[PDB]
Design an enzyme around this catalytic site. Structure first.
Site, PDB file in Angstrom:
ATOM      1  N   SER A 172       0.799  -1.212   0.000  1.00 40.36           N
ATOM      2  CA  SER A 172       0.000   0.000   0.000  1.00 40.36           C
ATOM      3  C   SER A 172       0.841   1.276   0.000  1.00 40.36           C
ATOM      4  O   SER A 172       1.846   1.375   0.714  1.00 40.36           O
ATOM      5  CB  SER A 172      -0.925  -0.019   1.234  1.00 40.36           C
ATOM      6  OG  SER A 172      -1.895  -1.053   1.065  1.00 40.36           O
ATOM      7  N   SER A 198       2.299  -7.262   1.356  1.00 43.83           N
ATOM      8  CA  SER A 198       1.190  -6.596   2.025  1.00 43.83           C
ATOM      9  C   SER A 198      -0.049  -6.649   1.140  1.00 43.83           C
ATOM     10  O   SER A 198      -0.464  -7.761   0.781  1.00 43.83           O
ATOM     11  CB  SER A 198       1.635  -5.157   2.340  1.00 43.83           C
ATOM     12  OG  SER A 198       0.777  -4.565   3.309  1.00 43.83           O
ATOM     13  N   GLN A 199      -0.706  -5.540   0.767  1.00 40.48           N
ATOM     14  CA  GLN A 199      -1.847  -5.621  -0.154  1.00 40.48           C
ATOM     15  C   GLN A 199      -1.472  -6.373  -1.444  1.00 40.48           C
ATOM     16  O   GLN A 199      -2.289  -7.119  -1.994  1.00 40.48           O
ATOM     17  CB  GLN A 199      -2.330  -4.182  -0.490  1.00 40.48           C
ATOM     18  CG  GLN A 199      -3.589  -4.286  -1.315  1.00 40.48           C
ATOM     19  CD  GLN A 199      -4.252  -2.974  -1.661  1.00 40.48           C
ATOM     20  OE1 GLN A 199      -5.066  -2.935  -2.597  1.00 40.48           O
ATOM     21  NE2 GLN A 199      -3.967  -1.868  -0.989  1.00 40.48           N
ATOM     22  N   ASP A 237       4.050  -9.059  13.261  1.00 38.36           N
ATOM     23  CA  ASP A 237       3.409  -8.398  12.134  1.00 38.36           C
ATOM     24  C   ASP A 237       1.959  -8.839  12.235  1.00 38.36           C
ATOM     25  O   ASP A 237       1.543  -9.930  11.830  1.00 38.36           O
ATOM     26  CB  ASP A 237       3.998  -8.841  10.783  1.00 38.36           C
ATOM     27  CG  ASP A 237       3.361  -8.101   9.611  1.00 38.36           C
ATOM     28  OD1 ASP A 237       2.413  -7.329   9.772  1.00 38.36           O
ATOM     29  OD2 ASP A 237       3.825  -8.275   8.501  1.00 38.36           O
ATOM     30  N   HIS A 245       5.926  -5.132  10.211  1.00 43.43           N
ATOM     31  CA  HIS A 245       5.393  -5.155   8.846  1.00 43.43           C
ATOM     32  C   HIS A 245       6.345  -4.452   7.881  1.00 43.43           C
ATOM     33  O   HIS A 245       6.296  -4.707   6.670  1.00 43.43           O
ATOM     34  CB  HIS A 245       4.011  -4.451   8.769  1.00 43.43           C
ATOM     35  CG  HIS A 245       3.246  -4.775   7.470  1.00 43.43           C
ATOM     36  ND1 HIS A 245       2.987  -5.983   6.960  1.00 43.43           N
ATOM     37  CD2 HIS A 245       2.691  -3.845   6.612  1.00 43.43           C
ATOM     38  CE1 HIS A 245       2.295  -5.838   5.839  1.00 43.43           C
ATOM     39  NE2 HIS A 245       2.135  -4.552   5.651  1.00 43.43           N
TER      40      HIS A 245
END
Length: 197
Positions: free
Chosen positions: A26, A104-105, A159, A172
């Site tokens: 993101s 992540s995303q 995370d 993260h």
């Protein structure tokens, strides 16, 4: 080095043997973000610049933070964009071995895309690496319809997105070492396992 469009730009008459498609996290810059460039440099060392095409997922994938909260952990438009890139690779270079990854995303996007992909193309992805996988708990560390032996998940202790939350905590943001060593190591090993050398 945060934007790479080697598959879109590449000549069909001189296809690379390996094509890597990567989705960033993101709010990250370019289409490779913070981890993709490290992975790309090590793949190029292994296969040579002409031997591997690096392709980030750009276009409709805006990597909007809020889309983490949508059902699949990203938007439908972003999934259509990455599916389109796997389909372009399969058409442009039918004999290339594919590899994929996301952070992540981008890891949720990679998992949703591979789940929806036509099986004959999905089966050409020799290895996938996922960092800070936001659907790790929900999917039990797997990508739906894709073998566990071809998957490697990097989920740091602490995370919170790996444990079912959408809170961003310091672990993260700590996948730099993995992107420099074990993640390209895994991808190179999985390509050599099927292509020899």
């Amino acid at each position: 080095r945060t934007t790479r469009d080697d598959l879109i730009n590449g000549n069909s008459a001189s296809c690379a043997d390996v094509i890597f498609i990567y989705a960033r996290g993101s709010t990250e810059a370019g289409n490779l973000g913070t981890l993709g460039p490290s992975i790309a440099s090590n793949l190029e060392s292994a296969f040579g610049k002409d031997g591997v095409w690096i392709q980030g997922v750009g276009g409709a994938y805006r990597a909007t933070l809020g889309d983490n909260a949508l059902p699949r952990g990203t938007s439908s438009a972003a999934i259509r964009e990455m599916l389109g890139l796997f389909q372009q690779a399969n058409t442009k270079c039918p004999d290339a071995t594919l590899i994929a990854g996301g952070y992540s995303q981008g890891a949720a996007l990679a998992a949703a895309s591979i789940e929806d992909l036509d099986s004959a193309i999905r089966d050409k992805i020799a290895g996938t690496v996922l960092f800070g996988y936001t659907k790790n708990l929900q999917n039990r560390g797997r990508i739906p319809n894709y073998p566990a032996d071809r998957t490697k998940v990097f989920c740091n202790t602490g995370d919170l997105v790996c444990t079912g939350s959408l809170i961003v905590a310091a672990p993260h943001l700590a996948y730099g070492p993995d992107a420099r060593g074990p993640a390209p190591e895994f991808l190179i090993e999985k390509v050599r396992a099927v292509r020899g050398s």
